[PDB]
Amino acid sequence: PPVTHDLRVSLEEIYSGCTKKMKISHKRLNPDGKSIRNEDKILTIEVKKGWKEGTKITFPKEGDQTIPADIVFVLKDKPHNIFKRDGSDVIYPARISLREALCGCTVNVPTLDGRTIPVVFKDVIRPGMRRKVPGEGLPLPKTPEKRGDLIIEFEVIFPERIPQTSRTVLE
Amino acid sequence: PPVTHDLRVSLEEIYSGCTKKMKISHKRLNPDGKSIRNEDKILTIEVKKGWKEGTKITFPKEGDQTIPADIVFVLKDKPHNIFKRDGSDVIYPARISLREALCGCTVNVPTLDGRTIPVVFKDVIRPGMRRKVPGEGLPLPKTPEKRGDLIIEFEVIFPERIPQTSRTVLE
């Protein structure tokens, strides 16, 4: 009769990999065969770079005291407030103005390392369009050596309203 | 040991409901206990208005000849070249130009009955935006009386390129 527990991991944590120690509380029958203990246990866990979230981590019979469940942790992606994980890829929503989308603009794409990258656009940018940024993603598990890509996904914000005059011009 | 068979139904067929007769071919042991027949069978099927596709239809032991499988048909939505079914709702993608999206336009929404409906738009239309059209959808099974809605989903087609001059103006 195992037990499941979610393991929250920041996107940067998955980028470089991290040590996460979890505090649990189980039961121990103690020198009686009647009384039960409270005692806890700090289970340490190594999260290897870019682990497809969802990967399971088991701790043998860490459960209670009659046989004790196998306490398992399921890796889960903490929603990040800048990127959307997509496997080894990390999507980056670019909120651009209609003017920018038409007359060209520059996008300072932020990196996991914590740096920025300038990417220029001359041609008309279509809503939905996306520019891939090679290797700016997450390291691939099988080959932590190489990393996935960063994907720019543009959102064109339109103006709220258009003056009676602007209409004329817009032809 | 049953047998499954997909049942292709046009969206209009699901709108009004239809009779669909399927031609199958089974086996019959014949007066021997050795020889086997070829003989077919035209299984008629009543498709009630707006049936959530996927609904199963069984034909008792229509299978072979030793016990014969139960030939079952799974309702499937024929992809329609104008609408996208969404339950009792039918989505309608409106390919509009950026000019139209900004200066207002008129959308002649086509109906399942085979008629058109004019819907006006004054305010700036945003890419992704959608206008619901009450009761223009598919009849609800539980209540064939009332129908679902027709949903307009706009797609703003941007111009391919913008002349060196247009840029200036666009401010």
Side-chain angles (χ1 to χ4, degrees), chain A residues 159 161-171, chain B residues 99 102-103 124 169-171:
Chain A
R161 63 162 174 298
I162 307 176
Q164 310 63 51
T165 56
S166 294
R167 300 167 196 290
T168 314
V169 184
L170 289 174
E171 285 78 318
Chain B
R99 192 217 264 188
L102 298 187
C103 306
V124 167
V169 184
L170 289 174
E171 285 78 318

Side-chain angles (χ1 to χ4, degrees), chain B residues 89-145:
Chain B
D89 286 295
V90 283
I91 308 176
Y92 176 72
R95 297 137 191 312
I96 184 200
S97 81
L98 176 67
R99 192 217 264 188
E100 300 179 80
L102 298 187
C103 306
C105 70
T106 274
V107 187
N108 308 302
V109 186
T111 309
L112 303 96
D113 298 282
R115 38 189 175 62
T116 255
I117 305 176
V119 179
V120 148
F121 301 79
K122 299 181 181 178
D123 303 296
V124 167
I125 306 175
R126 304 168 302 283
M129 191 182 100
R130 25 170 64 194
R131 264 284 169 289
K132 159 147 286 189
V133 179
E136 225 51 63
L138 296 162
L140 312 98
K142 176 187 181 300
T143 62
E145 251 30 57

Side-chain angles (χ1 to χ4, degrees), chain A residues 27-39 65:
Chain A
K27 300 305 185 178
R28 290 300 132 74
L29 194 62
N30 63 50
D32 299 304
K34 189 214 66 176
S35 302
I36 315 187
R37 206 77 68 180
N38 285 311
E39 60 180 296
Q65 204 88 302

Side-chain angles (χ1 to χ4, degrees), chain A residues 1 4-5 7 13 38 42 57 71 74 81-82 90 94-95 103-104 110 117 123 136 145-146 149 152-153 157 164-165:
Chain A
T4 50
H5 264 287
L7 203 198
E13 299 201 310
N38 285 311
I42 279 190
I57 284 72
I71 294 172
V74 187
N81 61 308
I82 288 180
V90 283
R95 297 137 191 312
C103 306
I117 305 176
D123 303 296
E136 225 51 63
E145 251 30 57
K146 35 196 56 180
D149 306 298
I152 295 184
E153 237 208 301
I157 287 65
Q164 310 63 51
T165 56

